[PDB]
Amino acid sequence: DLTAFREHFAKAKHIAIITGAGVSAESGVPTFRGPGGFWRKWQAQDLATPEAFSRDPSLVWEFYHYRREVMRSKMPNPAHLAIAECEARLGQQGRSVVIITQNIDELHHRAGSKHVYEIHGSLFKTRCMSCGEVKANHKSPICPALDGKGAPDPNTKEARIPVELLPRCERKSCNGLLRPHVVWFGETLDSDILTAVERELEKCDLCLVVGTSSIVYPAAMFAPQVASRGVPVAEFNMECTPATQKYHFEGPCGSTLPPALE
């Protein structure tokens, strides 16, 4: 029941919004998850690891180059926008809105969201393998050797770029090898980010979960911290809930969310 949700929304002064893959999916971003999402022969799991990067950095950068480049045509959807406009509108009223996203595509920044926490990092940030420096980067192509590479067809031929010519650190002292500043399978989340999110979820008096459920990583790390404090939690996703069974608004975030946040 929407009008009950809206009563909380009306009151709420510190709102946290946790966004999952569903919302990036609705803008047509590939997530490479479940059966169907392949890039060439492989799935996310195969390439998104420190093992794969150490063993074939040209292949992984090809994959990450592709994903960077498909974003030139995928745009924020109404869910992205309603969240950004909400943030802005409530900001002026001295209320507040934080976004905690597992997504790496910067669509929240591109819709105009500002207080965003990217817990899995970003396709358009690099980290130096040598000096560890994090730097924004939308350079297209990220480097010449990758130009028009990363093509997604199963029997595309590998680029096999020499590692010296892969993207490198700009401080010439260093010239270190860059990697996408994205959290890979079997790496740890940044501890400072988690400390901030903890802090934000403590202030929080209404919490939205969008394009994912409370039950699963990563929403499951946080939704308990808020729920235990008796704070309402609204899921907006495409997953059903059984006939018999805090708020859940079924259907697409693009359709469900803007009416809720107006």
Partner: peptide
Amino acid sequence: XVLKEYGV
């Protein structure tokens, strides 16, 4: 530190 996906 928190393993990503809880280490699936």
